[PDB]
Symmetry: D2
Subunit: 474 residues, 4 copies
Amino acid sequence: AKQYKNLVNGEWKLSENEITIYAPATGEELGSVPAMTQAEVDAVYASAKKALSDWRTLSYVERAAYLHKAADILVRDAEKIGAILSKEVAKGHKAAVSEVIRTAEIINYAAEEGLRMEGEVLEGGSFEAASKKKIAIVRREPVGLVLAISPFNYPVNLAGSKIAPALIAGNVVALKPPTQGSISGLLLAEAFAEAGIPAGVFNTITGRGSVIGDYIVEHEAVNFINFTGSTPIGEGIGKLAGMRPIMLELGGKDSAIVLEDADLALAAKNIVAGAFGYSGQRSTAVKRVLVMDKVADQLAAEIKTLVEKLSVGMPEDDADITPLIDTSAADFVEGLIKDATDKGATALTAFNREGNLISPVLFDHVTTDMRLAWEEPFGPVLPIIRVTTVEEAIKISNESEYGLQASIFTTNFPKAFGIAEQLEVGTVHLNNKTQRGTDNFPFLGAKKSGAGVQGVKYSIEAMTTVKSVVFDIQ
Amino acid sequence: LAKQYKNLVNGEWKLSENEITIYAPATGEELGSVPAMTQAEVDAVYASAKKALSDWRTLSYVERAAYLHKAADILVRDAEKIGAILSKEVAKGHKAAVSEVIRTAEIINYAAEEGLRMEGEVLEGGSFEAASKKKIAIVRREPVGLVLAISPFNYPVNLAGSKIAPALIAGNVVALKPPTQGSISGLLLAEAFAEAGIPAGVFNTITGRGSVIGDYIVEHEAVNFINFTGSTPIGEGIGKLAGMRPIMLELGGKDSAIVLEDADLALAAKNIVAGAFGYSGQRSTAVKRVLVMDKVADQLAAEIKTLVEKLSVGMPEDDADITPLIDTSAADFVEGLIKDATDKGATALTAFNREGNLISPVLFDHVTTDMRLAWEEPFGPVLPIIRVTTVEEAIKISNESEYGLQASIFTTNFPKAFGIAEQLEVGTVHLNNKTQRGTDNFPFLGAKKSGAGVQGVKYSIEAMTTVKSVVFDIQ
Amino acid sequence: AKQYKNLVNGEWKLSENEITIYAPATGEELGSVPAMTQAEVDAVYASAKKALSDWRTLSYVERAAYLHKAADILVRDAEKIGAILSKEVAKGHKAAVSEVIRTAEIINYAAEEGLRMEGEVLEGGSFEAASKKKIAIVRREPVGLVLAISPFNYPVNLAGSKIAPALIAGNVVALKPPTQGSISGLLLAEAFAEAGIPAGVFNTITGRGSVIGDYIVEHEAVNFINFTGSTPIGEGIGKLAGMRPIMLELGGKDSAIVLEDADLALAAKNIVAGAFGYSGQRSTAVKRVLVMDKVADQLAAEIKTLVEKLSVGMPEDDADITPLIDTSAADFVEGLIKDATDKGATALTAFNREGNLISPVLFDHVTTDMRLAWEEPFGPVLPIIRVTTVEEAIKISNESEYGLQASIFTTNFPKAFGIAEQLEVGTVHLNNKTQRGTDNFPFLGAKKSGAGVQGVKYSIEAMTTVKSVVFDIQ
Amino acid sequence: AKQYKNLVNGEWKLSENEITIYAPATGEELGSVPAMTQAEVDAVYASAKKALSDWRTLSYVERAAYLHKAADILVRDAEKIGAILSKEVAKGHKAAVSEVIRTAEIINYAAEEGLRMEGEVLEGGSFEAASKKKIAIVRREPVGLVLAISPFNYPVNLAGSKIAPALIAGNVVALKPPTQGSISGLLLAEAFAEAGIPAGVFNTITGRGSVIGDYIVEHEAVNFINFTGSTPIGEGIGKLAGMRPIMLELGGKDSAIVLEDADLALAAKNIVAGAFGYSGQRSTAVKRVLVMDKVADQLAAEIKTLVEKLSVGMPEDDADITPLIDTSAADFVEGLIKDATDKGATALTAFNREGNLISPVLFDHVTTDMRLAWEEPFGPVLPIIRVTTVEEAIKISNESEYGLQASIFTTNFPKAFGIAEQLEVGTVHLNNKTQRGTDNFPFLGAKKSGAGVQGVKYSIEAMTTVKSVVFDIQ
């Protein structure tokens, strides 16, 4: 029952009230985080804006040095941090440690990507002859204070994915972790503090949404909002963003389109790995199979045999399927399962629920009148929807309010490229499950899946602006 | 004389049951009417745009560029016909109005050629992890969808085209909402795109009263991107309605001209007057406060005053430097700022006179920070001179403004000027020249309340495009 | 038979002596071109260097305007120029006109690509903290005088592909067209002259290689040599270039690799179109089929049927197969045919020669001991070489001293991509004949196929340098 | 004194004959390096070409890992290597250590710059509507075997500046250091070997030029020559290169243009620092002052005083002026000094020679008739040339056959930029001495000063080619 503290202007601060964090899989009390007041948020932001001047005027090399050091510390403490991250969000122990290792890779990569970013020289004479001696020297500058809001399912990886790109460009950062995941976010903060990040350059905020939820976003000191979480929450942030740029990484309902010529065993392997990873609690994940009917029976059988083998149990045992993050999540997933059952879908694997541990449910013969065809479960349930034409698969895919990623399984890549052109998604994976990585690749979602382009170099670009200095050569 | 104008809706020209009569601000002459669209008519515009998006985005870049080049050619052909009406509609000098149309064609042509040669990128998985060395990402550009372009009264053609052409070349469809005062000129611009053969629904116009369709056009879920130029308050209101849609805002400015002791004062005065009083000060990018070191302030003020006294004041048809302001409220607001400065003891170096809404160019010296004129954007022909004692003080006063569009530094020490520029909270700093949006290939952006996003041709195209990534494993 | 003149310092000038040019297909006298002396080359280069200062200091907009005007004039006169080009190099009349139209497209594209090129601003602080106030303003500049040497087979297209990229970047140009093709190159020059190109900015040189061949390249006024022609001639230029940058577009022996799963009809169509276009007188042309044995018989039969449909005749009649450029070329092609026949190759179509008009010869069972497996014929003969494995196809392909392009015909795209990585060529076309276009794409050759990267933006880059201005911010 | 060996295919090889190396300032015997035969050169290139396939197929991150490890080893052993490097080339001890530290900086920077290099995707529809479905996937590839030839004055820095950018891109490398500097080059090689570089990926060649000088360059196994050295030697390489790409970093005669409004004390400080560094044995170095008449007298006085403060002594004592590299070098510098004296130049500082240790000689009233106005001394002698106009300064500067860098001293930066545009050099430094750094900035010379563009990212680009894969989307 350790009492965790926020990093504020280089110091660690409790608050008068606290929030106790329990492990979703066991109920174990993991500790508490501060329930900051609005005035304490004011001090976090005041500290950040004060530190911005000296931070942005450091060299890229100096800023990159802090990031690399913090990544080295994360690697050192990956087992320690991952062990707690596992408990806090009911993520498998090994996956939790992997998340911290991956966070280190992102931080190091962002440091080296950002430090060699360049400006441009534009010629007046490109546009008008009379300005041929007028040139613009266009250099990059930070946007200022970035509010990073990490999600429960990747409370270290999708905190670092915002912090490091922000910091290399000369921004200051305040991290608001989710309450479930606040310990892991504060453990990440410990690595940055030990790396010697200058006071105020990076700070953390924890507290109850009823007290500081909107206040942290509406605060005029914030110049940029970088958020990962649910679609409805992301929509609420867009309403509070005003003129300030935002990045939103929200939900998905990624389709896996399986054509008649697909390698059905490989498609099943990727589909199951992608759909049921972390019990389906991922934005990027196969969430519906759109399969040509000629291969639907064989594919359903190949998916069923794998889903039946998934382990269902506790995070400490590295179970494939772990308890969902809270009771509301499991209730919602059970409801989608019940709707599909009641509307006549075929349950190829049996629904079971012990507490919030839902066994993985595979439905065949899902029709688009069923909620499970569209709504994001964030739970271990996968529908198979049979189609008769590629055109019908494209229409059903694009009919979703979500547009994060898609997978296309086929041996005809020229056709798959033509399909990918028509899919309203950010990324199409050919003969592979959907995935955010590799983290240098762009990561973006269309429609209700978010706004902005992430991936390392793209997140740095998003959190930098330009300063043009124009003069006339004589 | 006065004509009834129509909106371009899905390849057809449509009247509405009601209309809005547009009058010339300088003379009161009736110029014509534009439709007062209803929300149902806006729905039909957006429905047609979304239906045209599929065929438009699948055309080749070269095909889309051809339409844009043809539209620009027609604008050039009709620059005198369009400029003459634009001049009357927003009280812009006749020659300056024709020049606006010509510049619009330049932007359209440049956008077509910039956008058609944009490229994708191939990323190596092995750049990040060895196990992904055979995985590559093919990243190609795609449009965002339907762009709502909202142009401003002061550049109803130029800052319409600066949105329409970058959006169109990338494969977006567009609906233009001109300002009511400027709607005729916006519809004349649309005529050129229609005659160029732009496919039905790829480009449409919307005109109407704010009280009827103002919020409706922005909140409509068919709109995927909002691109707005206008006042700061109206811009902030659009931000509240954007939701998750990306937006670009080009809002107000209070550009400072910092004059150091080693500056060429005569050249500084020339650039400061050209930039401060162009179009009677009705420009976001324009010198709106001089921050001058006290040692050179007396001589600089005398140089500026001499030039301001030479500015012509009169009617648009006479190509006066100072023309009547856009409306009475604008001139009333400017008169109030002048009075506050006078009553607080500023020195009127040139006299305040008002004929209708034609305010003579007023130069104030010894302006202090308690005066509204030190901070508020007049959008009128009034320039304060603020004396400073250190460059640090000039930097602090400049940055205290809630605006951060552009700034000018007048000095012979460019290394120092570059260091100053780094500290100024603005988009662009011009050295030994007035602030300005051009050349239109250069970035144009404002910090703080001056807006959001980066324009200039290539930057506008980048803003109104997204990416589509296709990832596969080499075998 | 007009007496053509060179464009020299804005003026059209004859020389003391001339060279009469005849149509290879008919012997018709087309006119004469000047036989410039070395002293006259000196005057051309002097005028060009004199014009360079005023030319490079113009705005990009102003230089682009001249190029667009010259392209419009080419479009206006495409029929007149193409009619003469057709006779001069025995190219089909319609193909000749198309070459002129393509040249206008390349010029217009070069003008708009070049005018919006930019520089870069590099930060000292990316490399060392102590240099964080030091920035480098890096702008592009012309290399100076570009010598452009066009080839007989594309004497307008592959002149303009050098002139326009050079000119937009602010270089001055001297065009040395080949004697056979000098009339067409001068006809191109007329368009640039009528467009108003300033005196000396663009000039032409014509003459006998024994008199000015090496002299035009060794001359110290030349800052860049941009040459298209035979490999041996290009190797000779590499020696004479010294330290000066060069681009060489030389020979090719492009392989068309046909795998067992290929679309054989598609492969046969593309192979025949590519191998026999302009009677095989193209560097980028399928010049050997490497086909898996299992599909060789059927592929050969389908190629044979298409070859037998090619028209054999005169340029004026738009014949597919026209007479070769000269007698030496036909003699050399006949020698390769005889060597293949003598060594046991199967003649699927029969050799026939009337003057220099050789009928298209398709050989099957070509082996690596035959000259036709390796030497570039520049004539209408195609060898089919049977392989047992894809590994063998890659080896045989890469054993060539040439490495311009390659074609891979197969339905397995990821495998084709892996093969492409292994091929020592500049460009690999999947399920398509090799081709240089579209002209925005890179065009380059490995090994003896040349040096430098062409395609419009690449050509501009090659013929520019950079000028770095470094200062410290204070 | 050690018997040094070449790194050949992961082994350290002796040759039958060897070359004893002596310290130029003391005559101390430092060791011997192998005198390789042409057959031993073949074995080096054979090993490299065999290692290339496995090395180019590694991921970027795997190649970068080797480079970082080699840089770490160099940092560790900087004192040990610098101590020997100081003796071998008579470089100040601390300066020799600084060279090794800078080489590690370049190696680390090259690793991270090259690992995130990207390809491009070009649209057929950018050029013609009919090809809108055709796209080109353009990816970078190594050129092959790079021959890296380092110079005596930077035998580690300007060996590493070639090795690391070549390696990260997937090339294999053979390093030929100069005989005087071979120990330092082989000491650098030890760091790459200990870092675990795969056998044959990196090798060294040492020997006498009469036996292997031309042989190493004209060998057809070599795909790229990357050379730093004298202009005459470099000229010879451009001839032996054929069509193969090269980079040449040759001599310079950098002008320092001092205008009437210049900070004369700052000008003198930078001029003396840049002109006399390493006794003037640097390509980038102020080698002639072009000063406007009205400030010449005062500038010359300030330069003279600073020249008199330079220490003149042995490398181990960190003297500013150390003995030149060999007797030939000092004989040549003495001849240039004598020519200036006999032609009436004013010797502001005294010429004294003890062995090969020449005291720093400053000349005023140097005219264009004197050899010192033009010839690169590579010794501690500096001419001051008075000019009457800025136009005369530009003309004299550009009349040099060299065009590496220039310095402009003035407070009128717009005018300085306009002057820089006219100066036929690669880089112009404003109010600073000329210098290669920072190593991320472009480094290049015009005219006889070299060919190609270095600095880190530019060297990587130079030693890469592109592979284009074109296909039609369906």
